[PDB]
Amino acid sequence: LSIAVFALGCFWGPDAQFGSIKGVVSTRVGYAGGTTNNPSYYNLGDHSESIEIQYDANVITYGELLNIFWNLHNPVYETTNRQYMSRIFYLDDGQKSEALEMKRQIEAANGEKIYTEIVPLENFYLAEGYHQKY
Amino acid sequence: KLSIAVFALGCFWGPDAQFGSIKGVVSTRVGYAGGTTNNPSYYNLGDHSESIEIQYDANVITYGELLNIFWNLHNPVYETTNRQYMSRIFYLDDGQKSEALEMKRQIEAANGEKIYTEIVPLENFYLAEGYHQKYYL
């Protein structure tokens, strides 16, 4: 086969991953709950670092996105910690239906338990930049 | 009017400054522990964080004295999810477990504030890079 070798450096990109997809028009990093009150960077409670993906469903579907999401990480570890967990926050019953569905597939396909949690999007805070001091 | 200095000191220097020159402590090694993944690496730590292995001579210093040093080095009275404010004791046997729990309760009783230090069993410990374990490629 052929071989390419690239170094990305530091100026990427948990959002750049999804942003590079055909049909997603913008992405924002944010913190998604979860119903813990008053999350902070010091204590996120049940909120998780998340990507809000605004996409044109005439170009990609929610199931195609689901597919790339699952190929972009390896959620085969038991972990209680909301912050290290693979999570899907559904916005409707359809997304949820679709997300439970493909999870079942993948688990069969390989046998492994997949630990992605399916929970409704109840809160979403944009990420704040750190305050500069002068 | 006060004056300002700004310094950067890497995290892995801390262990030897915190415990290294304590009488009875023979060595300290920085590592990674407390996560899930079978093999963290320089490129991805998974859910592990900075931990320290302290080798000590019990005829000189006790585990209790080390716990007192650990709790004199920080003030874990706020719930946190943040790795930079981690407070964790990894007990190697039930003797260490019970000494850590008993001292935690004593601190809580004496100062009136819940202590958010987690006391959990040591399962795996990975040796991290250092000036005496450079990990030459």
Residue numbers in the entry:
A (entry chain A): 7 to 140
B (entry chain B): 6 to 142
Sentences from the study reporting this entry:
Methionine sulfoxide reductases (Msrs) are ubiquitous and highly conserved enzymes that catalyze the reduction of methionine sulfoxide to methionine. MsrA is specific for the S-isomer of methionine sulfoxide and MsrB for the R-isomer. The anaerobic gram-positive bacterium Clostridium oremlandii contains a selenocysteine (Sec)-containing MsrA (CoMsrA). We recently determined the crystal structures of CoMsrA using the Cys version proteins. This enzyme is found to be a structurally unusual MsrA composed of two domains, a catalytic domain and a distinct helical domain absent from other known MsrA structures.
The crystal structure of the ΔH-domain form comprising residues 1–144, corresponding to the catalytic domain, was determined at a resolution of 1.76 Å. The monomer structure of the ΔH-domain protein folds into a similar rolled mixed β-sheet with three helices located at the exterior sides. The dimers are made by swapping of the N-terminus between two molecules. Each N-terminus including residues 6–18 extends outwards from the original molecule of full-length form, intruding between β2 and β3 of another symmetric molecule and forming a complete rolled mixed β-sheet. The ΔH-domain protein predominantly existed as a dimer in solution, which is in agreement with the crystallographic data. In contrast, in dimer B, Cys16 residues are closely located at a distance of 3.6 Å, but no disulfide bond is observed. The C-terminal region, including Tyr140, of the ΔH-domain protein is transformed into a flexible loop from the original helices structure. Loss of interactions with the catalytic domain by deleting the helical domain leads to collapse of the active site, thereby causing a loss of activity.
